[PDB]
Amino acid sequence: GKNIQVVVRCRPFNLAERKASAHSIVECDPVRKEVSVRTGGLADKSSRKTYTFDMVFGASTKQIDVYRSVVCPILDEVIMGYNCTIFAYGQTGTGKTFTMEGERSPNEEYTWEEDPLAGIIPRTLHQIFEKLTDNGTEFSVKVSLLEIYNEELFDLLNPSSDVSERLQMFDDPRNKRGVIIKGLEEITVHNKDEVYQILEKGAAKRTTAATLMNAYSSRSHSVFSVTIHMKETTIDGEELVKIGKLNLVDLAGSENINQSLLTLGRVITALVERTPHVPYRESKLTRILQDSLGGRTRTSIIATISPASLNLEETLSTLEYAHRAKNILNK
Ligand SMILES: Nc1ncnc2c1ncn2[C@@H]1O[C@H](COP(=O)(O)OP(=O)(O)O)[C@@H](O)[C@H]1O
Ligand SMILES: CCN(CC)C(=O)c1c(NC(=O)c2cccs2)sc2c1C[C@H](C)CC2
Ligand SMILES: [Mg+2]
């Protein structure tokens, strides 16, 4: 057994909000694992709504804080031969993509491997090599990026095929939580010095999918997957063979047509209510990620929220959803 761990990350105010002397309606207390939301009142007299999570990260949280506290422990587990998934869930504009992918610091100040704005995916890839290269491990790394837009499936990493070619999926008859995606490419990442270019290619494929599909970056779900095959020779000369898997899933924005997002919510409702039928089959996303939801994968949710009063209602909606999720048992 193990419950799904759910963490909240509040994003900071941006330029416009900061010059507009915006006041945060959100207070985060990481030590009591608590986010408090100002639901009407004033900064003078106020009703507040409070929520407890597995972790909360306030507006001051940096990319390094998330990597150290959330990602390292999960990566260690994938290195031990486990499957793990991290979802980012939240309204458009609250930092899902920032969290999972990150941005470049302006004016070329950093290399990619040192950029403070690097998110979970590049930091993860960089550390896999940095951990396994030096200790005595023979290992391979494959990555894939399967994205879902309007219940069709796209491979965003494959450098020799166009983005507009949809893929097909079927059930795996060997394993039962399982599906085969015909024609999804697993790209072998030979060393840390091939990481950037692989991701750059996918970036370029993203730009075009965006031209072709309306509000692609908001309405699409992406699943970036890393697989590590490892033959470890222990200092005692014993040879340990293991398979680690990590899914990094950047969900469609949750703001109030998206069958996968609808079904995700229904799948979570079913799992926390222990309704005996769980509607996995009702969308591509919940079929692909069936094992992440009441399955054998260690699963974490980062719910991204905003400090601004404008987003009160959607912030509340994110936190209620995220808060339900805590009750789901995986193994
Ligand atoms: N923790 C953060 N620190 C700095 N900027 C952030 C943070 N979270 C989100 N942002 C900023 O907010 C804007 C939108 O974030 P983005 O990753 O596109 O959100 P989403 O993917 O949820 O729609 C971007 O300008 C991004 O740089
Ligand atoms: C900054 C442009 N890049 C990196 C090429 C990204 O947008 C990006 C990622 N970010 C990054 O790799 C970085 C940010 C800052 C330092 S490294 S991770 C990722 C992509 C795109 C790809 C489709 C899937 C996974
Ligand atoms: Mg985004």
UniProtKB/Swiss-Prot annotation:
This is Kinesin-like protein KIF11. It is found in: Cytoplasm; Cytoplasm, Cytoskeleton, Spindle pole. The modification N6-acetyllysine is found at K131. Residues 3-328 form the Kinesin motor domain. It comes from Homo sapiens (Human). Interacts with the thyroid hormone receptor in the presence of thyroid hormone. Component of a large chromatin remodeling complex, at least composed of MYSM1, PCAF, RBM10 and KIF11/TRIP5. Interacts (via C-terminus) with the kinase NEK6 in both interphase and mitosis. Interacts with RARRES1 and AGBL2. Interacts with TPX2. It comes from the Eukaryota. ATP binds at G90, Q91, T92, G93, T94, G95, K96, T97. Motor protein required for establishing a bipolar spindle and thus contributing to chromosome congression during mitosis. Required in non-mitotic cells for transport of secretory proteins from the Golgi complex to the cell surface. It is linked to Microcephaly with or without chorioretinopathy, lymphedema, or impaired intellectual development: An autosomal dominant disorder that involves an overlapping but variable spectrum of central nervous system and ocular developmental anomalies. Microcephaly ranges from mild to severe and is often associated with mild to moderate developmental delay and a characteristic facial phenotype with upslanting palpebral fissures, broad nose with rounded tip, long philtrum with thin upper lip, prominent chin, and prominent ears. Belongs to the TRAFAC class myosin-kinesin ATPase superfamily. Kinesin family. BimC subfamily. A subset of this protein primarily localized at the spindle pole is phosphorylated by NEK6 during mitosis; phosphorylation is required for mitotic function.
